[PDB]
Amino acid sequence: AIYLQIADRICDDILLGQYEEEGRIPSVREYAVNANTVMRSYEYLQSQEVIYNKRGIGFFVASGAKMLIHSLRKEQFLKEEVGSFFRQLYTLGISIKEIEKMYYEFIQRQN
Amino acid sequence: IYLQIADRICDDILLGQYEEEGRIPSVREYASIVVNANTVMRSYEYLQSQEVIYNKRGIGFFVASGAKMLIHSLRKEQFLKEEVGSFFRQLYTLGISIKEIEKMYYEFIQRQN
């Protein structure tokens, strides 16, 4: 959903040190091909402590929102997918000794 | 669809319509000229995680340097899994020699020529 299809399109350019932690970020009017729902985007991200507000000044990345943001998407994976995914190895007759085989060998690919 | 697009664009690409290290226009724009927009998201993922393309962050997508050729191949190797099997079976069933069908791939080539 785009309330959150955008709230996730921001926390990343922070993990990339493009937006410095406790360094600033963009006027919405300017992040305007849409700036309407954005108010519900920035919403998500404020109520998620990812960013903060100076009265009349503008907008920064909350420090260690690098680390504030890493943390959020973790429990929205072990809640989200794992629980079915656990329940699939189950139904399928696959084991963790066979899955931590293909995983430890799965790094070979990315190096 | 998820896919069809790849071809209109790839053929844009093999037509050199889009240069390698050169830009394809917005996922906003292209869907007008053709008329849906968000299923045009389900494509550039497939493409840029298939390496025929990439998105400079905050600029757009580009042709990947060496694009015109992986395609031909992935066009070539896709002939090799579900398009070719469809065939050897028959040249087997109906009683067709290999050098049988081969005869008429060389008259084929001659008309091109």
From TrEMBL, chain B:
Domain HTH gntR-type intervals: 1-66
SMART domains, A to Z: HTH_GNTR
One Pfam match: GntR
GO MF, any single term: DNA-binding transcription factor activity
Coiled-coil parts of chain: none
GO biological process entries: regulation of DNA-templated transcription
Keyword match DNA-binding: yes
Signal peptide residue numbers: none
Gene3D superfamilies: 1.10.287.100, Winged helix-like DNA-binding domain superfamily/Winged helix DNA-binding domain
UniProt keywords, alphabetically: DNA-binding, Transcription, Transcription regulation
Protein name: Transcriptional regulator
Organism: Bacteroides thetaiotaomicron (strain ATCC 29148 / DSM 2079 / JCM 5827 / CCUG 10774 / NCTC 10582 / VPI-5482 / E50)
Organism lineage: Bacteria, Pseudomonadati, Bacteroidota, Bacteroidia, Bacteroidales
